Design a binder for this molecule. Structure first.
Ligand SMILES: [Mg+2]
Ligand SMILES: [Mg+2]
Ligand SMILES: [Mg+2]
Ligand SMILES: [Mg+2]
Lengths: 204, 226, 233, 125, 212, 195, 196, 222, 196, 195
């Protein structure tokens, strides 16, 4: 009944030293029934990464919408959109459906190509921006993620250390949520290289 | 949320806490609740956070255009009239509860506005879940003809009352001082009385702790030449 | 299950170095009607305890009779009824807390919020709360209803923790209580200007002050306030 | 009433000329000179304040106008047409950009929006 | 929750998962869903955990009193009926129970009774109860035979819970196995589903849909 | 409607759909074909609310046929499934949404690959090796999870499908009157007339 | 809320308390419920603060535009505009407004517009939650053609009792006097009116 | 309509060591968005080397603890001052809870102590009496924030040995009382940051063969 | 209903209207709401007629049995018996009773027992639906130690206004005077009190 | 439970009762015997709410067996049916009524006549040549109204019963997993093990 917990799933993003990381589980379900273990919730438009949790039809719809909008942005601006600018676009786009909203929990992650500054942001379903320095969490196991991130996180982690921290935050949070899991992906993002790792986790 | 507005000698000061919550969970521990409508007209919002931001930026946008059209610096009564007529039209469905303060050619002003479109005038105001804690302090220490320094003190003390006594409020105190014939000074994290203590342990993992199935490079670059 | 009819608002209290203070206004409201203006909601039990009650007044009068009967009963076959075997604040509280929880468990509560303030035999300060649910708690400052929201923040500025209690004199404590009652009169629509205040000190005993009034009120600034936005006159 | 001019007033002549645009350019030619120069660390725009009367306060007539905090405009030709274009340009910078991206438009895109408005007055009914 | 029990040549296999949830929140992964009523009788937990724990422990006390009075082991029929008659008295009050009372006596042989909080008492060969019961039934129905060996039967029960634990969001944690003989039940260990899944995937070649 | 199953094997997609149509008390029909051919190499089965199912399916069919004529070209199964998803995603926020769940089984002639897409009435799309809608998956997925291989032949797929239907006929309370089975491969769409 | 308007010999006086509540919490203890829609046409507001402010602002706009075209409007005209808004939008409004004004031709006039959007011209009017408690007092003590001082005393005493019994009413007593001489604002504090 | 239940917030945590056990809980008591008390003890010494906490609705929690303490007293009277073992106390509490199955104690109960072999023991109850012996259990408001952390840092879940890449698990080495107390403190410090009902103070009761000891730590008061 | 009891120098006087309504229909226009529970202890009834009659009958029985054993009861004792019934059965009763009596030792006493079953000893009391409209009038006009004639005038004027504004109140004004001299019944008709 | 049918022919009463037991989503059993022998020549089939059905049936069985022992005599089918009706009529105004419908098929040894009684959970008793409970009659009564004769043999009764079951299997949405058929005559009660 609650649209934000029909399909399940989680996304988490962290900042490190000259890097950012964004991760998600791979589950899609119809309440108790597991339907897909390949439903990735992280997308990217150039060097800007977007994770989306919530109702899966809206996740897919919003990805297609932001691809649409960032493609036109690029054609007109003659440059790729930046994390800070894209964050405002997501907020704008969500609030324009204020009284018929998309049931989602987006998370932006990326590095500004000019300043080199790491950036993350989170939103509620109608566009309110949470611009945290440390970490952003979203999904059916957001409480669990807040608990993991709050204790495991420390600032200025190197890329390869940040990977372990965010991976362990996601994994252990997902294992305490019935509607999350069935696989996981972690993106480690640097100014001009991005690595994507699929994690091994329990499949129940 | 705890937000206050206090009038003083030559201006007005507005203050707020920095906790944003999702029910009993703290989403952001250092939220910015002090918003700019125009350079010398600031407001603080309680209620639905997306509504308080959206309604400030919309009226702020229209206020800027109005300022340009009229070749005049924006007035607080204009921001107020525009806000209340917008909120009234949406019959309380836009859950924005604001305290609006500022200086303009007419003088210094302080207003509160509720989601349904009603407005109020005052020398001291409070709003949010910590408004009762804050108002207890304001009613105990407010007086006529406050100085700038006395008003900043009173305002931040009123926010502190909310921070310590209201569960919906916490973390830091933000302040913005709007004095007549001066630039408005925004004092982000004016007070920082809630720094987390050092943890007993480091939770930095050994590299290789996490099990990995696959690795791959993600192409973020555009299609290449040659 | 019922609904409160005639009600009493906030009861506020705090500890200080040698004892406790408790206060409550003299109003019995009938919804928004300020019906009864001479209601005493602080009820002394002996010379060491004062029970402050808010909520349903008919239930308050019932509790008042229970406490009166408690004193009678304690005196039965008790040669030390006015000495070693006198009623303690802790005895009185535990009895009330037992009744309140029993009544809520029969789904027929006494629709009240109660604060028992007193000084024990050994001179220790006693201050504990109980309500219609049987929920109990203690704190250096305690308040019911609106007082919880507006009085506690002010009183906690004087006694923020246990170690502040010995540093707090009776003059400072009473001052804080009286100011809080003024703030509640400004801001609680179901409050009155008239109130009662009781001090229970380990040295000077029980001092019960009736017919107190909220004074030193600020209203003058109202003359400058015009309209609701754009009005100038 | 109703605007019953739903047809174009600018049309191609046999020679391929759009007469009304050419004539608009002729009006610009009669206008007071304005110029712009770009430097390495800035841009300058300038014009003459051709006061219609010495009793007129020419400071109240702004030929150079702020469009955004980082964009300015000057013109040559019909002053009233310029004034309404400045109003539209200021508004479109907000409605089609700042309310979407939370930042002011880059010069080239604001120019593009103004250009679109001027193009439409060349084809609309 | 996923619980099953089936009769076969060598007695009864009882297999359960270990997960307990409160909404989406996984409260525990180490729940004991087999209640050791006594050394000869087993009961499964489904519905309200307290109702199953409490009344099946009470059942053990009644079974003990019976054998003291009658100097004879209680039948599975009689034991199951003590429980079903009890919950039937409470019918309408709000008990929630779905259990399989499993035993192996001389007169009856291996016997399973499905007992339920609305008063149902069914004797049968295969039962599966819980949110993941349909998944377990599929594996059971297609692989069940009376002439299964104890080893193969134990695996079948283990594999059937795994099937449910994978697909059902509210089933998982670990698998608990029991084998009920005439001389009593024998515990066959706790098996983490996480480790078991990968092991079964490799050895069996199943779950090709899942990347490992 | 009730049970619709799908399985993608090596070189084909197989869709199985129940034949029963029940209007409350009585089974009005036991030979209903719950499918529409969208293009020569794309088949869509459907289940959901009465009326809306056929209306939606025929509406999609008309649109894909229109595209085929306009461009003289058959859209890929992926392209068709995306079009269908958008229509359902559009529909879910309409005045009266299409309460229709679909499976799209297609053979991509460009990639020479079978493809199975599962889309529910919300517009939730997933590409799967095997799929179902309603309660069908609850009974059948444990069997498919065990036996499925990506290199299965069409005949092996049909045998695994029979096992699934047998389990449904055993444990499901409703009599769905068997299934019509159709195969989608490089040569197009054909119906298995004995199942 | 306790509000009233009383006609007297030289014109009319509006009176009001200053308490605005959100449940039992006094959100504003120094509210100004006496609002100006024209130079010598004011109103007393009761009901939804948002509604009565919105209505009053629209009326002020209408009478400003009326004045620009047709000169000073009558108090009856102002009441008509109020009524038109309150009646036509009765389903979506909770407003009880008393309109009071001074003409030179008509002198002091009072119109009350209760919930339904009906209009009633009266010698004096009372409204708000606190008015219930002073129906008897006001009916017994009102006289026509009172002096300014008598009318001030009548309003002060009436609202004093309304405040005494109504929890939703309180604070200061504000008054606005409308005569040929002009517009005079008055204020009376608790220590003054509580001892009456 | 009268609602006989309430929520007083709070969070509790019980961890069983090799030869010790801790039961910790914050000292904050709340209703809605107000603080009732910054120090209202929630974990109690019930005698016979048993510590107990019933978190949730404080009136029911106080009633249950009071009844159990009384049960210990009468156990001694009726059974020649026999020590009530932790397993016997657990079964006794089940019956106390299930006795109100149709009008429950709205609490999550945890007890801690040592078993009859001297090993650390923790038992966890639901509101209607279902119970289980556990190694690690958080209860109350911030339980969902704490338990995943404990799965990771106590049971070393999802942690593998470097170089093996998921083939060898991090071995489950025993934790000292000092090590456990660090994790408890960090758990509550983290919970205090992200949960509004958690704060003010932390009181830990440690149980060993020598008896029951207390430790108190301040927490943020916002 | 409009009911009141007022203590004065020589004792106490009870006052009441005579209207009993079933919705908007006046089922009885000549009701007697002043009921005797003892020789010089009477009560004014408001709320459910069935409940207040049942209660009064039980009290009359209790005080009759009290008198047989212990002699004349006090007015406080009568109020206590009323309270005991109203408080213990608060869930199933809708009764608002004013108790008034005359002792020689205590003289005139008035006790009001509102809905909850609480007791309040007062110099005078007002209750019933019509009382709301005369809180201000009664508070301004009541004095202690009035004469019999003043008290009759005070009650007559008060209930006159209550009847004027309250549709549920009307008919005649009944009064019962309780003094050392005895018990006197008074009645005042519409043509008398409407012109006040 | 679901379908229970009864038919009284020349010299016997035949009761047919479905074998399925469904608990919501799954069919837990497909061999359930929804009947109890009350006395050597009296059989009672039953359907209704879970638990209450068997509890009621066994309670009746115990009572009739008690009577049989006390008096050393078998009560007539009419007497048994009256006892059962009273128990249900008593039950319908209880705190929690037995939600159980029954058919009582008995052979009266005194009158040498078969007798079929239909009693619903309210205590509504009727003696019939053929009867049913629930929706069973909606599908079967038109066939019974046509073919039934009072002088039918047991074999003809079984054939007419087969036609009824076939119509049920065709038009009923639920799979009731066939029926167990039992015959009550002068020699007692026996089960037809192939149907
Ligand atoms: Mg999980
Ligand atoms: Mg699972
Ligand atoms: Mg008042
Ligand atoms: Mg906190």
């Amino acid at each position: 009944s609650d649209p934000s917990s029909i399909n399940g799933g989680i996304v988490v993003a962290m900042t490190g030293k000259d890097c950012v990381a964004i991760a998600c589980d791979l589950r899609l379900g119809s309440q108790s029934l597991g339907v897909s273990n390949k439903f990735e919730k992280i997308f990217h438009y150039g060097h800007v990464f977007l994770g989306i949790t919530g109702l899966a039809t809206d996740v897919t719809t919003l990805n297609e919408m932001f691809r649409y909008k960032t493609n036109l942005y690029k054609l007109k601006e003659e440059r790729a959109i930046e994390p800070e600018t894209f964050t405002q676009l997501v907020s704008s786009s969500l609030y324009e459906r204020r009284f018929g909203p998309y049931f989602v929990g987006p998370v932006v992650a990326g590095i500004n190509s000019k300043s080199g500054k790491p950036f993350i942001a989170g939103f509620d379903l109608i566009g309110c921006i949470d611009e945290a320095k440390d970490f952003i969490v979203s999904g059916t196991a957001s409480d669990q993620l807040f608990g993991m991130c709050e204790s495991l996180y420390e600032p200025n982690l190197e890329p390869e250390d940040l990977f372990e921290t965010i991976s362990q935050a996601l994994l252990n949070a997902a294992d305490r949520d019935a509607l999350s899991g069935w696989g996981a992906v972690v993106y480690i993002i640097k100014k001009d290289e991005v690595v994507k790792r699929y994690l091994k986790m329990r499949q129940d | 949320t705890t937000i206050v507005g206090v009038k003083f000698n030559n201006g007005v000061v507005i203050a707020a806490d920095t906790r944003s919550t999702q029910g009993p969970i703290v989403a952001d521990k250092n939220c910015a609740k002090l918003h700019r409508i125009s350079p010398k007209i600031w407001c603080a919002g309680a209620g639905t956070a997306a509504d308080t931001e959206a309604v400030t930026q919309l009226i702020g946008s229209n206020i800027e255009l109005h300022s340009l059209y009229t070749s005049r610096e924006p007035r607080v009564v204009s921001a107020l009239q525009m806000l209340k007529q917008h909120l009234f039209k949406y019959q309380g469905h836009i859950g924005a509860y604001l305290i609006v303060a500022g200086v303009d050619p007419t003088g210094s002003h302080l207003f509160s506005i509720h989601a349904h479109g009603s407005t109020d005038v005052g020398y001291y105001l409070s709003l949010g879940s910590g408004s009762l804690a804050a108002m207890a302090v304001l009613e105990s220490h407010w007086k006529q003809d406050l100085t700038k320094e006395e008003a900043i003190k009173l305002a931040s003390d009123a926010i502190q009352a909310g921070i310590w006594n209201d569960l919906g409020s916490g973390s830091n105190v933000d302040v913005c001082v709007m004095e007549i014939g001066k630039d408005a000074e925004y004092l982000r994290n004016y007070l920082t009385p809630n720094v987390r203590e050092e943890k007993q342990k480091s939770y930095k993992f050994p590299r290789g702790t996490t099990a990995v199935l696959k690795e791959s490079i993600v192409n973020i670059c555009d299609i290449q030449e040659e | 299950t019922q609904q409160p009819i005639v009600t009493g608002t906030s009861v506020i209290s705090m500890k200080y170095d040698n004892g406790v203070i408790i206060a409550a206004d003299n109003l019995g409201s009938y919804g928004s009607l300020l019906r009864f203006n001479g209601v005493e909601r602080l009820i002394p039990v002996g010379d060491n305890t004062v029970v402050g009650i808010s909520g349903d007044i008919s239930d308050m009068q019932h509790i008042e009779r229970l406490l009166k009967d408690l004193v009678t009963e304690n005196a039965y076959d008790n040669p030390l009824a006015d000495a070693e075997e006198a009623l303690e604040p802790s005895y009185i509280f535990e009895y009330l807390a037992t009744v309140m929880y029993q009544r809520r468990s029969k789904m027929n509560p006494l629709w009240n919020a109660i604060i028992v303030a007193g000084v024990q035999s050994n001179g220790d300060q006693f201050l504990r709360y109980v309500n219609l649910l049987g929920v109990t708690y203690s704190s250096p400052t305690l308040a019911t209803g609106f007082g919880a929201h507006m009085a506690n923040p002010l009183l906690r500025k004087v006694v923020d923790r246990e170690s502040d209690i010995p540093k707090t004199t009776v003059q400072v404590a009473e001052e804080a209580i009286v100011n809080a009652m003024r703030v509640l009169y400004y801001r609680d629509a179901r409050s009155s200007r008239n109130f009662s205040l009781a001090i229970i000190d380990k040295n000077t005993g029980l001092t019960f002050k009736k017919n107190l009034q909220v004074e030193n009120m600020k209203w003058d600034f109202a003359k400058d306030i015009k309209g609701y936005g754009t009005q100038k006159i | 009433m109703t605007d019953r001019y739903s047809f174009s007033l600018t049309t191609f002549s046999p020679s391929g000329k759009l007469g009304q645009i050419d004539y608009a350019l002729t009006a610009v030619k009669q206008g007071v000179t304005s110029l712009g120069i770009k430097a390495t660390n800035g841009v300058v725009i300038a014009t003459e304040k051709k006061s219609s009367s010495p009793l007129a306060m020419s400071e109240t007539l702004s030929k150079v106008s702020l469009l955004t905090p980082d964009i300015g405009a000057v013109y040559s030709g019909m002053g009233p047409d310029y004034r309404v274009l400045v109003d539209k340009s200021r508004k479109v910078a907000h409605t089609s950009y700042k309310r979407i991206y939370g930042e002011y438009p880059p010069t080239k895109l604001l120019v593009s929006e103004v250009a679109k408005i001027m193009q439409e007055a060349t084809q609309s009914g | 929750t996923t619980t099953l029990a089936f009769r076969f040549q060598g007695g009864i296999i009882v297999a359960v998962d270990s997960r307990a949830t409160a909404g989406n929140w996984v409260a525990s992964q180490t729940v004991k869903k087999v209640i050791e009523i006594n050394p000869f009788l087993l009961g499964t937990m489904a519905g309200c955990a307290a109702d199953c724990q409490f009344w099946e422990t009470w059942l053990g006390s009644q079974c003990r009193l019976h054998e003291l009075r009658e100097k004879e082991r209680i039948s599975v029929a009689a034991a199951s009926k003590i429980l079903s008659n009890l919950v039937y008295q409470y019918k309408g009050a709000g008990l929630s129970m779905g259990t399989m009372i499993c035993g192996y006596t001389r007169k009856e042989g291996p016997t399973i009774y499905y007992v339920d909080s609305d008063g149902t008492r069914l004797k049968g060969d295969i039962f599966c109860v819980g949110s993941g019961q349909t998944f377990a039934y599929g594996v059971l129905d297609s692989n069940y035979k009376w002439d299964l060996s104890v080893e193969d039967a134990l695996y079948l029960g283990k594999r059937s819970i795994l099937a449910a634990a994978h697909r059902d969001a509210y089933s998982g944690g670990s698998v608990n196995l029991y084998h009920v003989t005439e001389d009593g039940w024998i515990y066959h260990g706790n098996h983490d589903v996480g480790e078991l899944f990968w092991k079964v995937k490799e050895e069996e070649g199943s779950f090709n849909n899942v990347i490992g | 409607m009730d049970i619709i199953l799908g399985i993608r094997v090596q070189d084909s997609v197989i869709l199985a759909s129940s034949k029963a149509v029940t209007r409350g008390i009585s089974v009005l029909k036991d030979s209903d074909d719950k499918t529409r051919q969208l293009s020569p190499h794309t088949l869509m089965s459907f289940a959901g609310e009465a009326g809306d199912t056929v209306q939606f399916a025929e509406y999609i069919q008309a649109n894909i046929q229109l595209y085929s004529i306009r461009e003289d070209y058959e859209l890929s199964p992926q392209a068709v499934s995306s079009f269908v998803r958008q229509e359902l995603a559009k529909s879910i926020r309409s005045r009266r949404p299409y309460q229709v769940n679909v499976l799209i089984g297609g053979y991509d002639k460009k990639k020479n690959k079978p493809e199975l897409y599962q889309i529910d009435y919300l517009g939730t799309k997933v590409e799967l090796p095997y799929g179902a809608h309603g309660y069908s998956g609850f009974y059948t997925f444990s069997l498919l999870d065990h036996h499925y291989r990506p290199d299965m032949t069409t005949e092996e797929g049909l045998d695994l499908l029979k096992l699934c239907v047998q389990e449904l006929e055993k444990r499901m309370p409703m009599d769905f009157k068997g299934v019509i089975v159709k195969i989608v491969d490089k040569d197009g769409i054909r119906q298995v007339d004995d199942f | 809320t306790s509000i009233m308007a009383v006609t007297f010999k030289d014109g009319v006086i509006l009176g009001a308390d200053s308490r605005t509540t959100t449940g039992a919490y006094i959100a504003n203890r120094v509210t100004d419920k006496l609002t100006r829609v024209h130079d010598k046409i004011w109103c007393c507001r009761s009901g939804s603060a948002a509604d009565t402010q919105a209505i009053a602002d629209i009326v002020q706009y209408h009478l400003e535009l009326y004045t620009s075209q047709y000169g000073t409007p009558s108090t009856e005209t102002a009441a008509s505009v109020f009524k038109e808004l309150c009646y036509e939008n009765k389903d979506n409004l909770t407003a009880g407004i008393i309109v009071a004004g001074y003409d030179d031709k008509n002198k002091g006039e009072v119109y009350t517009i209760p919930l339904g959007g009906s209009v009633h011209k009266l010698p004096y009017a009372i409204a708000g939650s606190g008015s219930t408690f002073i129906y008897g007092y006001c009916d017994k003590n009102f006289r026509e053609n009172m002096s300014k001082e008598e009318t001030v005393d009548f309003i002060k005493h009436s609202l004093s009792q309304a405040i005494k019994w109504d929890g939703s009413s309180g604070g200061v007593i504000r008054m606005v006097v409308l005569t040929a001489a002009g517009v005079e604002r008055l204020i009376f504090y608790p220590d003054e009116y509580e001892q009456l | 309509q009268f609602n006989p239940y309430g929520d007083n917030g709070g969070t509790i945590l019980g961890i069983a060591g090799e030869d010790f056990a801790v039961l910790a809980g914050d000292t904050r008591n709340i209703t809605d968005y107000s603080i009732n008390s910054r120090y209202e003890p929630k974990v109690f010494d019930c005698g016979d080397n048993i510590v107990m906490s019933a978190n949730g609705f404080a009136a029911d929690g106080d009633a249950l603890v009071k009844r159990f303490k009384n049960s210990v007293k009468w156990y001694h009277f009726d059974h020649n001052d026999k020590k009530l073992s932790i397993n016997s106390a657990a079964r006794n509490i089940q019956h106390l809870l299930y006795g109100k199955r149709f009008f429950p104690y709205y609490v999550h109960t945890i007890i801690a102590g040592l078993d009859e072999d001297g090993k650390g023991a923790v038992y966890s109850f639901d509101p209607v009496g279902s119970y289980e012996r556990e190694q690690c259990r958080a209860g109350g408001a911030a339980a969902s924030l704490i338990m995943p952390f404990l799965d990771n840092q106590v049971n070393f879940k999802n942690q593998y040995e470097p170089g093996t890449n998921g083939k060898v698990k991090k071995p489950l080495k025993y934790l000292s009382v000092e090590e456990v107390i660090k994790l408890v403190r960090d758990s509550f410090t983290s919970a205090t940051e992200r949960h509004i009902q958690v704060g003010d103070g932390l009181e830990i009761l440690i149980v060993t063969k020598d008896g029951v000891r207390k430790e108190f730590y301040e927490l943020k008061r916002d």
